[PDB]
Amino acid sequence: GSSGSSGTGEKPYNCEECGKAFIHDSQLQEHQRIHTGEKPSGPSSG
Ligand SMILES: [Zn+2]
Q: What is the CATH number of the domain that holds 46?
A: 3.30.160.60
Q: How far, in Å, is the centroid of ligand 1 from the Cα of 31?
A: 6
Q: Residue 6: inside a domain, yes or no? A: no
Give ∠ CA 17-4-45 in degrees, rounded to 5.
25
Domain span including residue 17: 11-46
The residues that bridge with 12 in the sheet, in sequence order, are: none
Q: How far, in Å, is the centroid of ligand 1 from the Cα of 25?
A: 13
H helix and E strand count, the chain: 1, 2
Q: Which amino acid is at 27?
A: Q
CB atoms near residue 43 (< 10 Å):
11
Q: Residue 46: inside a domain, yes or no? A: yes
Number of domains in the chain: 1
